[PDB]
Design a protein around this ligand. Structure first.
Ligand code: LFX
Ligand code: LFX
Ligand code: MG
Ligand code: MG
Lengths: 481, 222, 481, 222
DNA sequence: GACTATGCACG
DNA sequence: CGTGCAT
DNA sequence: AGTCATTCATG
DNA sequence: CATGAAT
């Protein structure tokens, strides 16, 4: 009833367990599908539950309870908040959950509890899940040992670069900014053709990030550094206009702010600058944003120090901030700090394995059906005898054995024959069958081609990647200066 | 705590009393802030027919209403909005909350109602839709309107029954129940007074045996 | 964009809606299965989800999310708290949900959140659900109009009297105390034989309630009044012992307290009596209850005023309280105040309808299978021709028509024949079939008997009621004085 | 807030530090109140290697520990329990919490550990059962013990993997981890001091670059 | 249903 | 000063 | 994952 | 002064 351990051992073994789990299984994104385990489980669960984009929204609580009871052994709050986040166009460049109800805002208000909202997967999220039922991807057991779960998703576009990630564990942290789907795709495609793609040319397709919040991004040199090493500081500057004000008054207008900042608070601080008179061009500050548009009006008074005062805010408020790239992902089960090349290459390598496995699956399915169809073709020629032999047997198993021994059918063939229902006899057309046969034999050859020909395989990757480009492409929001 | 209108104008300023901290959020998000204020009520409102005066004034919801409006409760009158609009779920509990607020306004702010300053908002009961990027949606408030919509959207089109305000986004809340041009409100009037006072007291009052009878007589639980 | 209504109309229509719903669909128990809508939905849902007693406990959150998204349009807290309550042996005489985790206690501590606990239906709860899949009971649509829900459960024992209910709506309230399963059953059985059972004899089987908390109950006269009218005050007195204390000291011990009171608080008040010295026999007060037993020790000092002091507590603390019967249930969609007779009679009348419907269902199923089996018997005699005719047809539908027209089989018969698989031909035994035939024909006669013979029907009710008695009977806990 | 033992005895009095308000409830319910006290910690405990002194003493969990125990933090020593037992989930986060508490005890209450007064409790990781009124159950703590149990219960018997303390009732908590006769505890000792101090500082400390290296060197994420 | 404190990295 | 999965 | 107020009937 | 489905 008593053991002894040193504090030295307890700490090491405990901390080791916590750190490892935090790193792999909690805080950090897989480099391939760009997902943290919670997110992946949310997607995988909602999809298994046929809670997709083309069907009715479902009561958030049901989805969460389901994720929690089958896949994710942590609190409902964690799951739900993670869910809400995946539904926020200001946080993700491409939203992966669509939600109905109050789900927060830029002014940082509290999202409504799961007992109010309703959710479903978005359309593009279905793409991360594409082919998941063709054994394309490694499965593991859940905690119950009652069901299997994916360790990574098929990921039909490159979610890591697109939605980005952040990002705090033990020992490492991660900050990755969102990027433009179309652009990322274009780079990946280039790298497929030219594997040794140097960073410089890549930048030509993929230049700087693309924040959902738009704004202006300065630091090409810094961006190159981040894409090269993994780390960089870039400057993010909210987007401004000028308005002329009846009466010799000038107005400062802001219509995009930096990624990840609380608009309500930004406004308050801009106002605080005025109250304390930390600058002179101060007048009134007003937030006039409504459904369908962001508008921040800082109108000054007489001495329109406009360029002077504007410049002050960029310094002292968050109207201008910096963003740091710290690109850390999980590669081969362990944290790596990565620039664009490794991220792109591993994503490609992943689609390779996926496309190969998909094909291997589809091939097998086809040869199995072929094998059966060849059997049916033969059966027809001796139908009367085969029916007789079956009537003469003693049970299912005995009939099967007789077909095998007597007519040399295989087990899989006998089983298929013996289970035909009677009405099937209504059609004894060798021709219809042969047509199916030829179709199968062609599916098989084409699959065999994709499998044993790195080139055709890679061509398929490209075709698919471009199809996703056309369907989901959207214009840039961030500008680069 | 209350989410103000940007400008002060007793002439065209709206005070939404919303059932739920959460719907209150949505209302804040989807709304013209130039002149509509939002005041969420957290859970069931005190019954002011059945309570003492002490309890009433010590109640957070009642006091914030009183302060935001101005007048008092004597009341005085015009301060401070030209519309007090009660916005709740179209469900039984929402109905209960309208009862509770109307009792309050009736009993203390009585002139507000007489000058036709108290409204009730009509959230749509139904949404019609027919996948993805090209999904179309319409809204209906009644037995009949729904009938209209289903024939228009014909088959394939699926129907949603709104179980509450929480289920709708902010732009939607604007489009269907907050935007003066498109919204439909009910305006509460009193026709008589004594008739009203009797009813309010039998329903909302302390005694019970009469409420029971009212229910046996009038509620037809078939 | 504007309507006008008087405040007079708004109030009436609103309040009417709220009251009706509160009365029927929230606060008050159906007189038949003794359940409030939330409870019924909890049971119905957990059972549909195969979350029964004989399988593994499930994560409470999943169950709740499921109840909420399919059946119950209210908050998770309401559902979960109602669930927890159904799992509390101190509140229900027969628990209907078994839970794993902290689910409260008598000292009134907060149950653990749904994200910790695990649940399943208890065994006896499966009995409320018995036969629910044989169309024995009225179904309605859920709010989605996506699924159907029971309006009442089959209720194979009389849950209303057993677990009781409380109980607050608009206009009415309900308080019903728990009763001893065995006893209630015994009364019901008597009333089945002697429908005009007067209350007096009924009391002979069912005398006073049986609280899970045990204790002592005084007021036979009052109990009669409650069972007669619906209303009564009974006295409930905690159960006491005396201990002799080395040193001329006497100890007061309590080992059962009244139904529905907070033991931790009872203790505190007993202590408060001592501090303020509201009585002299005061000494020390100690709660020494552990897992597996309730023990409250009030030991006095020198002047052992024992019977004097004990008597004081019975008055001034809750060691003794009264309980009031206000038996209100929903009968024919409307609230009724009821004594034992109406409750028992309606429960019987309900089992009647259930047993009739069950039988009607089982009969139909049987005649359908018989009809098919008769067909198969014929088929065998002309098998060769029938097979030929099928091979000669054009498709399923054409073969069916030919069997009908040619051999006068019915549609249901043709369909069954035509869908037989080939291996079935492996057995052409008229005898095996005829045996099934005879068995069916006997099921049918027996069902026809139950249906058209009030007496045999009522005999079945009794047999079944007694089987439930044997399986679930437990001894009384409350005593009557 | 703390749930005391009925009697004061520095000699055989147990202080359970439990992870969760909720498990704390269960522990209160299932336990010998004659001499075991319960003190739940709400969420993650402050890291006392990485903080200032101000933050630490202003922390609710730390202060209540200090007060309930007595000594102080200089510490003095015997007041006030003869066992401080850390009881958490056998999962990663529980492991994290043991790290955090041991760092505290190590840094401020150091003599407590040296005199062998700090324990860690071992909740069972597995429950075995084979329906209804006759359901039988056994508990196992390890790879091997489970192997033992499955052969005994043979087939039909199903296994539960405890994902936390919340999943077990009060009597169970007593039977498996609280009842001195049947419970198994780990007793924390320190062998050396300098070795300990280094480790505690690299893991729990402010700097990081060294923690990272420790992790790259020692954590085998295969 | 809002609020309330912590770990973890980092700038 | 605050990020987001965890307690 | 506590705490916080209110409806409704009633004794 | 609470009880228990609702907000
Ligand atoms: C772990 C529980 C208990 O304590 C919590 C908080 N406390 C801070 C530290 N305590 C000493 C006082 C209370 C808190 F502020 C937030 C949460 C919280 O957000 C939460 C949730 O599931 O996400 C769950 N809990 C929280
Ligand atoms: C409706 C929301 C908001 O408010 C609530 C409370 N208040 C906050 C301040 N209010 C002005 C009145 C009291 C409260 F004390 C309890 C609950 C609560 O238990 C709860 C639940 O789901 O069951 C939900 N809510 C509660
Ligand atoms: Mg509602
Ligand atoms: Mg845990």
């Amino acid at each position: 009833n008593i053991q002894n351990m040193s504090l030295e051992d307890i700490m090491g073994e405990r901390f080791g367990r916590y750190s490892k789990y935090i790193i792999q299984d909690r805080a950090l994104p897989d480099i391939r599908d760009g997902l943290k385990p919670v997110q992946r489980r949310i997607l995988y669960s909602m999809n298994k539950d046929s809670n997709t984009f083309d069907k009715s929204y479902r009561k958030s609580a049901k989805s969460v309870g389901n994720i929690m009871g089958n896949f994710h052994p942590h609190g409902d709050s964690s799951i739900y908040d993670a869910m809400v986040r995946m539904s926020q166009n200001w946080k993700n460049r491409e939203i992966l959950v669509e939600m109905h109800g109050n789900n927060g805002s830029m002014d940082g208000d509290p999202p409504a509890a799961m007992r109010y909202t309703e959710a479903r997967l978005s359309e593009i999220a279905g793409y991360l899940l594409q082919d998941i039922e063709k054994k394309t991807v490694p499965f593991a057991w859940n905690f119950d040992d009652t069901e299997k779960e994916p360790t990574v998703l098929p990921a039909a576009f490159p979610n890591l670069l697109v939605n980005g990630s952040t990002g705090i564990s033990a020992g490492y942290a991660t900050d990755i900014p969102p990027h433009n789907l179309a652009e990322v795709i274009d780079a990946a495609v280039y790298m497929i053709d030219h594997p040794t793609a140097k960073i410089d040319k890549l930048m030509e397709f993929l230049p700087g990030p693309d924040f959902p919040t738009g704004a202006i991004i300065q630091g090409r040199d810094e961006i190159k550094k981040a894409y090269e090493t993994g780390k960089g500081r870039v400057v993010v500057r909210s987007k401004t206009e000028i308005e002329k004000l009846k009466g010799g008054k000038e107005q400062i207008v802001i219509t995009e702010i930096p990624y990840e900042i609380n608009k309500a608070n930004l406004v308050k601080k801009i106002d605080d600058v005025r109250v304390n008179n930390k600058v002179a061009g101060i007048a009134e500050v007003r937030d006039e944003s409504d459904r369908d548009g962001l508008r921040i009006a800082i109108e000054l008074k007489k001495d329109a120090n406009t360029e002077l005062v504007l410049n002050y805010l960029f310094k002292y408020t968050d109207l201008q901030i910096n963003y740091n790239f710290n690109m850390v992902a999980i590669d081969n089960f362990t944290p790596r700090q990565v620039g664009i090349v490794p991220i792109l290459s591993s994503y490609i390598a992943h689609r390779r394995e996926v496309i190969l496995a998909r094909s291997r699956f589809d091939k097998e399915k086809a040869e199995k059906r072929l094998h059966i169809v060849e059997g049916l073709i033969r059966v027809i020629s001796i139908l009367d005898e085969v029916i007789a032999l079956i009537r003469a047997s003693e049970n299912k198993a005995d009939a099967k054995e007789n077909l095998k021994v007597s007519y040399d059918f295989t087990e899989e063939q006998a089983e298929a024959i013996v289970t035909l229902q009677l009405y099937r006899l209504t059609n004894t057309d060798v021709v219809v069958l042969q047509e199916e046969e030829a179709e199968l034999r062609e599916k098989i050859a084409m699959l065999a081609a994709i499998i044993g020909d790195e080139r055709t395989m890679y061509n398929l990757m490209k075709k698919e990647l471009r199809e996703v480009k056309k369907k989901f492409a959207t214009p840039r929001l961030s500008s680069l200066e | 705590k209350l989410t103000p209108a940007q400008s002060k104008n007793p002439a065209k300023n709206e005070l939404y009393l919303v059932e739920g901290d959460s719907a209150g959020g949505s209302a804040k998000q989807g709304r013209d802030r130039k002149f509509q204020a939002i005041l969420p009520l957290r859970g069931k409102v005190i019954n002011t027919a059945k309570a003492k005066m002490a309890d009433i004034l010590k109640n957070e919801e009642i006091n914030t209403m009183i302060y935001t409006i101005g007048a008092g409760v004597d009341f005085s009158i015009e301060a401070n909005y030209d519309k007090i609009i009660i916005m709740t779920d179209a469900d039984t509990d929402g109905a209960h909350i309208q009862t509770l607020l109307l009792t309050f306004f009736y009993r203390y702010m009585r002139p507000l109602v007489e000058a036709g300053h108290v409204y009730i908002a009509l959230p749509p009961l139904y949404k019609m839709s027919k996948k993805g990027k090209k999904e179309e949606v319409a809204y209906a408030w009644t037995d009949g309107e729904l009938e209209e919509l289903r024939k228009q959207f014909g088959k394939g089109a699926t129907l949603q029954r709104y179980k509450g305000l929480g289920e709708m986004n902010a732009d939607q809340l604007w489009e269907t129940t907050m935007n003066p041009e498109t919204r439909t409100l009910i305006r509460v009037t009193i026709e008589d007074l004594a008739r009203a006072e009797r009813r309010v007291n039998v329903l909302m009052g302390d005694k019970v045996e009469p409420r029971r009878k009212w229910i046996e007589d009038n509620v037809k639980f078939t």
